[PDB]
Structures are given as C-alpha cells and as structure tokens.
Ligand binder design. Structure first.
Ligand SMILES: *[C@@H]1O[C@H](CO)[C@@H](O)[C@H](O)[C@H]1NC(C)=O
Ligand SMILES: *[C@@H]1O[C@H](CO)[C@@H](O)[C@H](O)[C@H]1NC(C)=O
Lengths: 97, 48
C-alpha cells in the first residue's frame, strides 16, 4: 500500500489444497509444469482463499479442468489451451482409451 | 522391472537394485507412471 506498478496482471483460477503449496516461483508438479508456471524472478503476490460455497453442490460438480499430459514443460506466463491426446509409444493414435 | 513389479519392499527393508551396463532412456520411466512428484536431487530429467 506504499508502492506503484507500471502494470498489474491478475490471474485467477481454482486449484486444490496441495496445489496452493505447489504454486510458487519455480516449483515441481503437473500444475507448476503443465498448467501454470510463474517466472523465477517473480515480483508479485499469490492470493488463496477457501471456496467450498461456489465450487460445490449436492450430487457433485465436475466443471473445472486441469492438464496432466503435455509434450513439454510450461514456459512462464504462457497458456496451452488445447485438446490433443498424448502420444504413447509410437502410435499416431487420436482418441481415448 | 523396477516399475513393472508389484511387491515393492516396505520402507523398513528398502529393496535396492543396481542398474549397470545398459542405455537409459527415461521415457519408459515417464510412461510407466502418472507422476506425483519428480523432485530430482542429482541431474535434471531434461539432461538425464
Ligand atoms: C509393465 O509393462 C507391461 C507392458 O507395457 C504391462 O503389460 C504391465 O501391466 C506393466 N506392469 C505394471 C505393474 O505397470
Ligand atoms: C529386490 O529386487 C530384485 C530384482 O527385481 C528381486 O529379485 C528381489 O527378490 C527383490 N527383493 C525383495 C525383498 O523384493
């Protein structure tokens, strides 16, 4: 409350409890490697508060998403929205199963 | 083997294999496990 910033970027997303510990400049994990990666020289703040009242209901809710299968690591502040089936072995297979 | 075993030792007696005289391509290690933590304390997986 005593600083000024050329520009401010606010990135918002719901993640799980352990993932809050995972989110930090340069950590290991399928979120901090394939889903979101902060730069090593990060100059900012990470906010995390519990939300069981907006992301939950009776009979469940599976709306949200997250990536475990990427061809490579995630560069800092780079989005990888895409639906491509991960290759296994040497098959050009396109599908589930 | 080390990953397509079943009876992985209890921690009180940690089974220890030796890997030698072979060529290591850790993509098999990658596709044999939906990894939860790959904290390397030696060589980076990229340069492994
Ligand atoms: C080991 O690999 C073979 C061939 O991919 C597979 O049939 C077997 O189920 C695997 N075993 C384990 C425990 O992953
Ligand atoms: C340790 O691993 C070797 C190689 O797979 C196996 O032959 C041996 O029986 C194992 N020992 C235990 C305690 O499982």
């Amino acid at each position: 409350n005593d600083l000024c910033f050329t520009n401010v970027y606010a990135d918002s997303f719901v993640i799980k409890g352990n993932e809050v510990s995972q989110i930090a400049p340069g950590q290991t994990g399928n979120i901090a490697d394939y889903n979101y990666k902060l730069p090593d020289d990060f100059t900012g703040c990470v906010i995390a508060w519990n939300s069981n009242k907006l992301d939950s209901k009776h009979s469940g809710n599976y709306d949200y998403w997250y990536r475990s299968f990427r061809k490579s690591k995630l560069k800092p502040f780079e989005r990888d929205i895409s639906t491509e089936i991960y290759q296994a072995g040497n098959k050009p297979c396109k599908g589930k199963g | 083997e080390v990953f397509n075993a079943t009876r992985f030792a209890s921690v009180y007696a940690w089974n220890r294999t030796r890997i030698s005289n072979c060529v290591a391509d850790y993509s098999v290690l990658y596709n044999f496990a939906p990894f939860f933590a790959f904290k390397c304390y030696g060589v980076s997986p990229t340069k492994l």
